[PDB]
Amino acid sequence: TAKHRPSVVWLHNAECVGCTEAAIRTIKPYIDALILDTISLDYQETIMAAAGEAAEAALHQALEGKDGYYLVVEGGLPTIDGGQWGMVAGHPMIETTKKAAAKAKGIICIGTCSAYGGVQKAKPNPSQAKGVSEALGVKTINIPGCPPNPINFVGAVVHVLTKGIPDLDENGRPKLFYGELVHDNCPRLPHFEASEFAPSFDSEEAKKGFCLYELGCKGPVTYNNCPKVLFNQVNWPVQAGHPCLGCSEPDFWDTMTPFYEQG
Amino acid sequence: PTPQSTFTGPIVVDPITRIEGHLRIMVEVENGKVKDAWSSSQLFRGLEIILKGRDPRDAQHFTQRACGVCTYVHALASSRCVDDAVKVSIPANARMMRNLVMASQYLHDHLVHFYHLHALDWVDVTAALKADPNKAAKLAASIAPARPGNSAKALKAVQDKLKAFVESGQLGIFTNAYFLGGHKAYYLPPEVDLIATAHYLEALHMQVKAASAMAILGGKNPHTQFTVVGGCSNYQGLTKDPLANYLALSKEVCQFVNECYIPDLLAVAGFYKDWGGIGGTSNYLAFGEFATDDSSPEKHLATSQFPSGVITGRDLGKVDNVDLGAIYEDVKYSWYAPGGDGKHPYDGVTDPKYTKLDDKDHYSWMKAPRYKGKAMEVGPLARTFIAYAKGQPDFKKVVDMVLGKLSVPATALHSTLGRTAARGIETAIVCANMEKWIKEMADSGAKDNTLCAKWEMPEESKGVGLADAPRGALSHWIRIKGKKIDNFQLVVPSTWNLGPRGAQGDKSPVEEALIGTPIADPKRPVEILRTVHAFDPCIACGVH
Ligand code: SF4
Ligand code: SF4
Ligand code: FCO
Ligand code: F3S
Ligand SMILES: [Mg+2]
Ligand code: NI
């Protein structure tokens, strides 16, 4: 036959490719199945065959597709000096992202950087990095975390193609994945309630897997699904004895630091 | 006969796709050969600026976000860094765990590099459709180890999937590929293309497993969360059931390394032997990795099982020790303020100053790291030469074998083909060492589970963290003042390999490696990609 698959354009701005990497850890479905049977991934610098002008041209073909497209943005937008501190093909990233956004059926921000500005926006923000919605002035579906769980990202993508925009919180996050506090689903909750905290990482308390609140854990103020779905089908930070950094909250680099404290 | 056109003039490839981060490459070409080159990194973030005045404990979490592909390695280098500054010696178990996580990272990172970033430069995916899948099964049955993935039936099913995908008219990531309609510089038989493509798809599944393995110890991937000042937080990682799962997953990954990666690599290398004479450089640096003693930077350099060393002028008879005081970064040809040349990283300065695109005087967001005035190639090829030169038994055996299967001299390794082969060579070696390293930690962990040492924050101090990351010699350098970050500088493998010219106008490794690159087709200059990709560039790592 030939069932047409929805066009996805994926842009990389000021990013670390961690979001791309996280996406490709999907197992429901695997990334191959997703790009062969579910979507048409039509621009993606990390893995696309074309380079240079050939790549640029594939982008512009995708943008002018008769059937429209969805936009996935990974990374914040550096806006200083006319946005020249972040360029692709000799164009400021703000300018290309603006142009791709104008006509997108929907915009999905993958990761804290695109959603809210991320690691480059942290004080003193030398590149004047913004999040997409702020830089462009358009509503974005935010899939944050640094990086987000592929389950959250693929789920959102599938959800937007087959049902519509999902219910979002005040921060633009799908309530399906971000509706609950890390802390409310943490196996160490009973330790927290009984005020059983590890005072250091070397302590016997740490060995006994006591709560990590006193070591800076931001679980109590972070919205994400980590302890419920885990990462890589095996683990999550607190299971590995490490406090949550609050990496799915906007501007967490500045609001959650110092990471090993609560002050 | 290496294909080469008569093209004279400039070529710009921007974006360089299939790398990490944002790279523009400019060449001058004459009679179809690259005669000059510029490596122009196109993004600045400024992590070093961001860290000034912050909690030294916080650095590992910021710096890990220099990059999501070489995830971990920055958090590891920061932790080593701060551990050094505070003068704490991490427990045995911590050394073991940190080193095993690095091993898992090499496996994951290298596998994805060859198949998902590098292979499309050498493999014509569309030409796979022309193979007979029976003849391709016979070909795979005759080179590579026996496996069900390699049967006519499995190869046919790959071919059928690809066929319906191309016939759909939506080529997705293959849109405008340099191989579409054939290309003089692509030499592989259709059967080889089909085998490699099957393995490309398999690899997409296998890298999930590699990351799972890594996560058992790292807590998650990407961006691990198990390292702390004084050691590691993951007591569970020292336990039996997680370690048995870690081993089991690691052996599956390594089976795929031995069954698919290495044989595909060697087939590719066999067909493109001419690439053993293109893309060579002369100086190699490594800080070493997988040390038996990580109590200090000096001990790391001395006892790294993948040894440290410096090779100059391809001289494999004189491996020098690494002089950490001899490292400095220039900025003359970079987008930084005047007066920042020659800085040792402890005195490093990150004062960004953009000019304009393709300003030959300032054309990269990367600094130019130099070692006594010399550019240095880092990474698997550097590690391989240094290890081979010191008679490291695994490197000598595997390298001499690769040389024996390919029928080329060791000097053919100073090349893009060599650079590519090295990457697979050390992957098979990490794989051969996994069971031993896991047993060492399982045994130690069961005897005593100490994983983090006590430490005190000093008012004032400096420290350096060294690691040999998948792309090469990585160093993080801190000055603490008032118990805070006074200066924090990253010098990263891609900075070494892909930075611009130094203060003397001297080309970096990649810029030199590109000189004499043949261009069969100026419209579709895959050869540029072959060599750049061979360095496994990460601009986000490079510029931070
Ligand atoms: S959100 Fe985190 S993992 Fe994703 S691009 Fe930004 S720094 Fe990288
Ligand atoms: S470890 Fe963190 S998320 Fe878990 S109970 Fe304690 S404070 Fe909450
Ligand atoms: N490996 C890796 Fe990333 C780079 N370059 C780092 O450090
Ligand atoms: S740091 Fe991030 S990944 Fe989950 S456990 Fe905390 S939100
Ligand atoms: Mg630096
Ligand atoms: Ni990197």
XYZ file of C-alpha atoms and ligand atoms in Angstrom, chain A residues 182 222 224 226 231 236-237 244-248, chain B residues 220 225, ligand 4:
21
model
C 8.802 12.295 42.520
C 9.820 17.952 41.587
C 8.224 13.641 37.217
C 11.019 8.538 37.671
C 15.102 4.589 33.523
C 16.592 5.829 39.009
C 18.829 8.221 40.922
C 17.015 14.108 42.957
C 18.343 17.350 41.337
C 14.831 18.494 40.348
C 15.811 18.345 36.728
C 12.273 18.526 35.320
C 20.045 6.286 34.749
C 23.568 10.164 39.112
S 16.940 14.635 38.966
Fe 15.608 14.307 37.261
S 15.533 12.336 36.274
Fe 14.079 12.213 37.914
S 14.889 11.712 39.882
Fe 15.080 13.913 39.782
S 13.615 14.397 38.163
